Write a protein that binds this ligand. Sequence first.
Ligand code: NAG
Ligand code: NAG
Ligand code: NI
Lengths: 463, 461, 94, 98, 148, 149
Amino acid sequence: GPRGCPTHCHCEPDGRMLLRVDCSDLGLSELPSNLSVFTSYLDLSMNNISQLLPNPLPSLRFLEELRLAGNALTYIPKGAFTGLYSLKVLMLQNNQLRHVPTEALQNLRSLQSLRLDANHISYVPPSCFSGLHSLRHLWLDDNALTEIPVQAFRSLSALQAMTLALNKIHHIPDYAFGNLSSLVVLHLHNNRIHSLGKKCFDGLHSLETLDLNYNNLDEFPTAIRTLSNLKELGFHSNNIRSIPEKAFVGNPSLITIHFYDNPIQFVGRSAFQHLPELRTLTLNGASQITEFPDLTGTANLESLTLTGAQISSLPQTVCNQLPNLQVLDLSYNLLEDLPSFSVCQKLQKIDLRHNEIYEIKVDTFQQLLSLRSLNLAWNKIAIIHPNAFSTLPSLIKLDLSSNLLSSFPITGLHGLTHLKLTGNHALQSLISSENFPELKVIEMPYAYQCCAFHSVQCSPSPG
Amino acid sequence: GPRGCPTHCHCEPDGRMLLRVDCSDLGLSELPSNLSVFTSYLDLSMNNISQLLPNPLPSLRFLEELRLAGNALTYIPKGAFTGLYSLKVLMLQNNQLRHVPTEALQNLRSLQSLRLDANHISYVPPSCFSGLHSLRHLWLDDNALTEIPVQAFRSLSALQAMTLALNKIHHIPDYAFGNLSSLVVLHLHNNRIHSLGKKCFDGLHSLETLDLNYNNLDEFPTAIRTLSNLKELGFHSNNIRSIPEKAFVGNPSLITIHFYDNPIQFVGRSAFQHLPELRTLTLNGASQITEFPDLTGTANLESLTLTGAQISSLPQTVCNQLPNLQVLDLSYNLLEDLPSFSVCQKLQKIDLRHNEIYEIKVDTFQQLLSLRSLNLAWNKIAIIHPNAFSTLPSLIKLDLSSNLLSSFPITGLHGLTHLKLTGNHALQSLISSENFPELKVIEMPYAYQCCAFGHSVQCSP
Amino acid sequence: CAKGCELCSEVNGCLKCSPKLFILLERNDIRQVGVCLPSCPPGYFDARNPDMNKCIKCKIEHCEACFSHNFCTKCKEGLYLHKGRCYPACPEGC
Amino acid sequence: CAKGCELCSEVNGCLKCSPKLFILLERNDIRQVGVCLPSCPPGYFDARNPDMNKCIKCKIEHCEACFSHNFCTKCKEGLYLHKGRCYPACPEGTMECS
Amino acid sequence: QKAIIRVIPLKMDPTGKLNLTLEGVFAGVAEITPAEGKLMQSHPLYLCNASDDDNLEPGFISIVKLESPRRAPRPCLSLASKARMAGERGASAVLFDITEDRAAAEQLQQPLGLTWPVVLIWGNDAEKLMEFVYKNQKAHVRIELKEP
Amino acid sequence: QKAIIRVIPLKMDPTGKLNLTLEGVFAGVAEITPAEGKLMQSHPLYLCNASDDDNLEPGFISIVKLESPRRAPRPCLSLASKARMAGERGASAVLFDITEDRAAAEQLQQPLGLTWPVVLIWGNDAEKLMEFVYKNQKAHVRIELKEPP
Ligand SMILES: *[C@@H]1O[C@H](CO)[C@@H](O)[C@H](O)[C@H]1NC(C)=O
Ligand SMILES: *[C@@H]1O[C@H](CO)[C@@H](O)[C@H](O)[C@H]1NC(C)=O
Ligand code: NI
């Protein structure tokens, strides 16, 4: 009743005593007079307010959330917000501020969320945040920052989330965040960063997510060894060329690590030790990788892709470290003699295409009851032991293409839905009577065993 | 005896008084010992010299070229080269210097060529080049530089050629080369450069080649407007996203401009005006380009590729600005109604594949006597006027594929070596009876008018 | 073409928004349509990207406003909020 | 495997040189073989690159030694050397036109 | 070679007589096997590196109406990659309305053998399927795909 | 489909009977016409953008012995691009010895129709051609790429 709405806005009762006022998107300048001292929420988004120099309302002591996003603010006067004793959330995105207000924000002691994203902010006055003892989330996303405002951040010990993404920061010095001991998330993506101090993250005792994606990083960000609580790390799309030995020793809780779209050439054998929370590891094109990585500590990988390197041999015991592996892909390597993948009991897809494999034996794929696909395309495979596919019940797809198979070929297997044999050249002895029913996609080396023979799609060219 | 080769080196007469001495790759230290005072060229490359003094020779009055490349030098003493009065060329690449020697190089007044590449140089003492009044070529290629040594370069007014490539320079400030008024070539490729002063090249009055390739450039290097003598500009493989409206007004002598492998989205219509020396222009993937660029001043293009944008119409007069054009490629655009390409008299290859062309009329390709190839694949291309192929003598290849034909195709063209018609769905009028004798490969929509015939020559399917 | 949308379809609605705006893919019907709004709605957070700003669904158990996909800012009444996730029981102090 | 070469063939000789060295493809006569040398020879200039350093043929008219493909450092006797190119007649100013 | 495509609304008219049957091509990224499912239209931006899986009932058939590859924002993924995603996320089958981006055909050409089938469809049949889907309002349908 | 390959050394031999004959495949990048020329081996790095053209008298046939695509540096150009270059630079035909990089076949597969023919050749025959070309020697030779049978 006595609370009441300003002209054109939509209001709502917040509880028995307070008022939720929405005045967004009715082009305005400075709204009042006659807004209720009992207003707890005030949306002034998407208007034309270029100055709230000629009011404001320092009487709104119950105001929890104030939205001024999407106006034309270029300047915030020292006392713009004096009197807002209950102010929890302050939204200022998408205006045209060029610096963070020097004083207007000091001592807003209840303030927990501050949005300054999408302005033209090139400067953070060193004490502009002085007094923000409750500040938990700070968004400076999409401005014109060129450097980390180290002094100004000193006094944000309670800060839990921050973005500085989409700015132009090119360097992070040691201790740049040294006092943000509560920080959980930090976003620095889409900046211009070519250099990290060796301690630039020292101080961030609580950090769990760290986002360096899309920068110009030159080398692996060693400063992470200190971030013990890290769960999510991103540095994809940089120009990092190697991942060192013991890269992640400091970060045992890592669940996700993104580093694709980096010209990574080498990785340390130890790089991924002790990552019990890691569930997938994929390394494409790490062309100078010679050895197979050690995975002690890292037993819960259910997918492991390591393509395009120069691994010639697997340790005999490799599956000891792969108890839960479901997908293995060592495509485009230098593998000749391969061991028994039997301990890899949960394996259900294998890809060894483009290696230097010549002989598969009884052991190699034995007792892999869950194994659905096996691709061995483009090897030197001459001799497949006759029982080698015997213990492979789930086996649906089998690609033996382009290797020097022949007399003799393939049986005791039979559950197939897909078979590729194309490119096998001493296999004119292409007898292939459909003993095994299940097949719905064949590829035969010679055109003839397609028509020479229930949708049996066949290749190459049925005559 | 007086002319004298040290024990294991190979020597040679230089002129009739002087001696060319090649020691080089016999692991050594200070020695050689018995060096002819008449030695003009001394190669001490690829040895194990880690330290100079006992400096066997400050008596080599006639030494023009000294090669110490590929040793283990970490330090050069102040007087390492005193006495080398004729020293023109000094090679120190591929050692382990961490700074340019503070003094050893000062006042080598005959010195014209200095190699300091492939060291571990992180620091250039501000006076290290003091006195190098003849220095013409300087190589600092492949070291650990993080910044331009502005002071130390102040005193290199005779320098004509320089590399700083393969370092870690991330920024060039205004006036960084302000006193290198003789510089002709400058290489900065493969650094780490994200920022250029608006006047970082002010001073380089004679610069003709400039190489910013492989850096992290954010925006088009405006500081070039001052480089009036520029002939060769490279900034390919950066992260520049647009080329502005009068990008090259300052550089009328440009012959070559490399900017590929940049995510370039827009170019100013005026960008390439007044480049009479440009011979080729290629813009692939500048997807927000709407208009066809203006080429006033720029009449000598013999090749122009502008693919993958949104150009819907060419000005009626476009060939007025293309008198010497030989190759035109406007692949993957939005072209519907196209004008006469007759004024483009020298044209000998055309590619308009993947446009929205429906109608070819008799002007369009008329009087193009040098025209060998014409590709019109993947248009809306329903009609072809009487013989918009009559006046095309040189025409060897014609690709009309994945078109909207046939309601009357054509044979008033007769010399062909290649024809593609594949992908046209109403060309049931597929009655083609071969008045095309010379032709060596074909693509017919259906196998049936294909292979209907029978020195010998293919077709498909 | 729609309010702050600079590229349209009948089938797909909006295809590119104005600079500082966010694109939401609204699913009606059999339909999935592009919409451009200045701030994201309740299920979502704003996610500024250089090529395209995008409203992204807040998927953190019992959260009603997040900062990012992983980090809640306000848990439903009356759960306890600790380090950006939502619990029944507040370990150590929320 | 050859002197400073870290990757070989019989047919192709050298395929990758040690870090700071240059690769020259030496032809003789049917053969074209990779060779690694510390500095390039006379026809050529050194051209350092992050992936592969490479000896490049100095192509420019009457030049005996260049700095780069474009810029001559020593013209044949007795031509005049001006701004890295070689002329018979020295425009505007020992055979080094300046 | 080619694809017949039934369009059965979960309603229910004897003269409207199973209202649309249309024709299309099989795409070489995929296999050639049949499929069946509810019809779901998805925005081409949905099949992008960072989008929210809508987590539909697995087994649906998605229809994607491509846009001018010339006016439109640069695509987040290859069209092959998009075809894969739609299946990994939701279903065999994937239907691409190729009217506005004819060239799609030659992009969805090279094989990578996808368990789910992908079927291209242009001008006049496609024009009616979308006629059926500004909304019109419901809509609500079941699609069968099979070869002769 | 397939390619006959004559190898005639420029050393007098009425008895050195039809001296060497070998077999190979035709690419698909190329056109399948025959060709003839002196035999010249070129390093795979030669066919790189845009190394120094040796400026041989056009009409020679180049043999390129590919290397392990796994031990060897990331290649400067696609193998198709390389095949093009070799011809633009003079070669009447291009011969790729693919013993060590079997997968080349599927890279030199998609057509772009090259006036010059390119012919792939593995283990058996190739081994003898290099037996020839290797030191012992750069032995002058003349090659006929006799079209199919
Ligand atoms: C750092 O944060 C601490 C601990 O919360 C606070 O007491 C101190 O004032 C801060 N340092 C500065 C310089 O603001
Ligand atoms: C700069 O260049 C002029 C021009 O020759 C020269 O005389 C002057 O001494 C140079 N040195 C400095 C430090 O400016
Ligand atoms: Ni920097």
